[PDB]
């Protein structure tokens, strides 16, 4: 239990690591199988220090056939994937839809230093999961030089 | 939905303490008002905020009530407390009055 | 919570562990500046140039572990994540900052586990 | 001062208790003379993890003349009120009112999970303070089984 | 910062003193989550079958100091929400947490009081 | 994380020393109330009668040691926000108090430095 | 290090320290030579307890030649500086300006109880810094009376 120390707060890091690393399909329509809308269940967010260099990303714009987005507005702190290999651009309809777009695995929507319960409209995400770890100041300055 | 006043029609000598029953259409939401009409006038509170009177009302009007039963009682009638008395209510931005209570003597 | 450091015996160690499926590359990124002019908002890095790269090799499946820690603290964090009603950003690295604190000093006898006192040095100078 | 011990953050929860509780009027005739509209005053909010289950709950909407709603809109987490036995729906008018609607006596207008100084528009809410105590994990599992 | 607690002689505890009004039953909800697919988001609850059911019986007057505990702890709160600017939600939780670090070691003498220290234990070892 | 204090030799002392150009006078103004109805959001202040006035005296270079205090830790102040994606507001005073148990608290020997544990009534209680 | 020993999290406060106190230029026109529009950069915001009496505050509103206003909008938390000795209503023009206006200095466009990167739209401020420090019921007691 005594083992290993914390200095200050900031060297506690959360790291986010795509599913592509776990391989899984990275395919768009493989991925489109893992995310369903759902009413009745609130966005949430959480924050991020570090993440891993995604193989995929997706910028979805799912539509009513009359034309509205029903991806949720994102709010101002939500923004693109820093590091992505390719991005597929998918333009998609869904007439039935309700709610908000959920992830069917549990997983989490990674945007820039923010993993989201919610895929929000036209920001490139990325699949993934973060872990929470401690690196102290010194070993944080030798993996990033 | 529905606004009773009970009874319809009454009829007691001078000198009777008299009690008139009104059930609002929802619970109390804004102030209870009770009104007199004597034949041909306007009508003229007596009672407001189920309790308190209005200033040169007689001591002997008096009320009481909670919820959405509430009553209406005078302490010794007199001749010229022949009217029909109405309840008013303030519910869903409307002013519903009671159907009437006529008082005969 | 787990820590990662320089080998004791530029390899790296991880405290963790659980007791082919996990990718053996760990390319990363950080907004973490080294310590003249670039920590004024206006100067310095923008939203292209602010990212630092990093890289973890696999030592003794390394990255797998991590990779295997997330599987696993998602499901956790999932359910931390339903009593909160915020919709904005809530800051994990407090929580756990704070957790670390109570389950190290949140009453504990000096002798035994549970209270990491250190009296190595304490019984030499009593002699 | 030593009595007494807190093993997670996870283990202090603050409580939301009706002033139902208190026997006080339940009414809402009586519960209206109980706020008031107040201009000059920031509106704050509390978050809580348990509240009671009220004996009577309001879904109020004062309006102007005009028709205008002078409650305050409510922000995304202010959800209703989880465990109502009657929710009066009261609509009311007030043209001199100005500023947002606070309470009178200092207590809180208790939304899901979250306590307000201010009535919020369209939102159902009861009346209540809450308190800070700790239960640990296998005490609180006890409780509600 | 009181607790709540198994009686230690379902009956309750609580460490609160305060040196008819109040109501004997005391029914109560939850959010937290019994420890397969539940915690994913889409499954599991939505926002009726979220909240489960408690009950606490007045054991010693146990609701009633519950009660008057929020009708006072209310006067602190209201004047701690003063300083902070921000409209949105608070949390209240992480700030008990750190304040009950800081009551206890927030520089202490090992005998006497503020100082939770077990040498009970270490007494006998150093005979 | 210094400490502001009266002089133990209203004169103030201050723990901080940084090893003309100031103003001497220094008016501030806070919203700390002290402690029948004014805690009340209906009552009491306002946003006008909101703030009292203070008065620290420059004595030893004090106004000028904290003058030059938020000149500098500003510079780190701008890197520890660019990490923190919410445009809201963030909370300092909670993470500058974790900080402060995490460096006294966040493994330590009883003698010597870096564990601030009182024996001296302990050494005395032994013989 | 052991030295000085902090009680409650209530007592740690964090003071704003005008740059009028730093004897810089008060004057509108050399204080509008310290701030500048980027684009790229996000808005981040600090809340503090206690701050100084301004000597110049300002409020300033940069309009495009077509009258759009380029500050940014205010979030509900940010309000006008408290004390100040003089405001200086300043309306300027700029047409090639893009971003957000933030400050050459690193210093924070001082709010009440907030410091900001960015200046808002229609808000008095005042330029200045914050520090970290630690002072006690007793001793705030006394500065205040
Ligand atoms: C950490 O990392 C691990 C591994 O990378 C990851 O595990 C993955 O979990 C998800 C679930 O969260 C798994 O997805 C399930 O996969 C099974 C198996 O699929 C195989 O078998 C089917 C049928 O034989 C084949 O057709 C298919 O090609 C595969 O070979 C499915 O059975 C699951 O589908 C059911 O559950 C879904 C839940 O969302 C339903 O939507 C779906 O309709 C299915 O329901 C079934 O039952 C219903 C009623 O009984 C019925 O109505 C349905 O018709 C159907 O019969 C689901 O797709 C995934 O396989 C796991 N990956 C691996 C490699 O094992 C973790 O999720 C990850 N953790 C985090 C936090 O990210
Ligand atoms: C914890 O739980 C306790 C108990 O449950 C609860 O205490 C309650 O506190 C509130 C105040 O916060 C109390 O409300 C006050 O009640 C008194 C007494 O009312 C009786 O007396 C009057 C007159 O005799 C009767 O008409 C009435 O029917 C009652 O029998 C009132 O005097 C108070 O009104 C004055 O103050 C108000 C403040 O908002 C004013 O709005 C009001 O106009 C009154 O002002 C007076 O003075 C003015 C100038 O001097 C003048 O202009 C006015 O006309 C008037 O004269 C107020 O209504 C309540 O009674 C307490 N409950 C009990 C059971 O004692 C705590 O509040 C609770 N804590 C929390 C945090 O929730
Ligand atoms: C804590 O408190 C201290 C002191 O109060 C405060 O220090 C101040 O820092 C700022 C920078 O952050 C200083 O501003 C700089 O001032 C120098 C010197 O100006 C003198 O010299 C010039 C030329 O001789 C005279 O014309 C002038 O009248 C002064 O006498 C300037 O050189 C700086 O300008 C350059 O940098 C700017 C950065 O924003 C550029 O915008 C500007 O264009 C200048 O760039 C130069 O180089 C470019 C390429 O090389 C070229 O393109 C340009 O044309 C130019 O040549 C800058 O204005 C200020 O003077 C300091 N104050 C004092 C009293 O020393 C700290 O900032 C404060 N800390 C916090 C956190 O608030
Ligand atoms: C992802 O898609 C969104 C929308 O499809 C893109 O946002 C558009 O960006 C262009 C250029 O900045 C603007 O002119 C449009 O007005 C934007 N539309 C919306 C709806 O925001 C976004 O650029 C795409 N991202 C990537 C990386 O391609
Ligand atoms: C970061 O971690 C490294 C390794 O844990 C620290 O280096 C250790 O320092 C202690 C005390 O000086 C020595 O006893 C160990 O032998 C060192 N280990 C190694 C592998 O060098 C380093 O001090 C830490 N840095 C900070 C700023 O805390
Ligand atoms: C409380 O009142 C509000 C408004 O009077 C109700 O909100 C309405 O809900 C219906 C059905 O969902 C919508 O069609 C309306 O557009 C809503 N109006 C507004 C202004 O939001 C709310 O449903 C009521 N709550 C309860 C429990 O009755
Ligand atoms: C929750 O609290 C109970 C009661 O305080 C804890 O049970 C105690 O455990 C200690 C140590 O094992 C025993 O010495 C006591 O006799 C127990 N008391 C009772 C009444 O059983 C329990 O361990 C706590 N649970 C957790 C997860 O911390
Ligand atoms: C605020 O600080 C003052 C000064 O540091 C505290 O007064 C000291 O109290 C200790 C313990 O009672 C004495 O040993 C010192 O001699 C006192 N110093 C002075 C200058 O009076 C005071 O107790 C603190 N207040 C609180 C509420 O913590
Ligand atoms: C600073 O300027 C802003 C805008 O120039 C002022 O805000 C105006 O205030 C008046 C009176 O309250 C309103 O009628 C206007 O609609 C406001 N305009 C905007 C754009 O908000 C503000 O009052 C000024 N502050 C000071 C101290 O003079």
Known sequence: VCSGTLQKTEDVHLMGFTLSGQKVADSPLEASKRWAFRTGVP???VEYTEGEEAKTCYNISVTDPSGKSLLLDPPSNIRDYPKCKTVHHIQGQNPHAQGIALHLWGAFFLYDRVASTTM???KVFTEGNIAAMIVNKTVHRMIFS | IQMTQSPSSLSASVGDRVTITCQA???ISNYLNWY??????APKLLIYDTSNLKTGVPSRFSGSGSGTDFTFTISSLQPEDIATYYCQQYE????????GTKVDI | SPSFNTSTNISLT???FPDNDCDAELRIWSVQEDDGLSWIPFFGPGIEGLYTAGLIKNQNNLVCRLRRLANQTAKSLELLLRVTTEERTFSLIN??????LLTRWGTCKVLGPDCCIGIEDLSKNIS
């Open chain 1, 43 to 45: 966005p949430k967010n």
């Open chain 1, 120 to 122: 929000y409209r036209g």
């Open chain 2, 25 to 27: 259409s929802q619970v």
């Open chain 2, 36 to 41: 007199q009409q004597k034949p041909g006038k």
């Open chain 2, 92 to 99: 869903n931005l409307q002013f519903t009055f009671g159907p």
């Open chain 3, 14 to 16: 991880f405290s963790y």
């Open chain 3, 95 to 100: 929580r756990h900052a704070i957790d670390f």
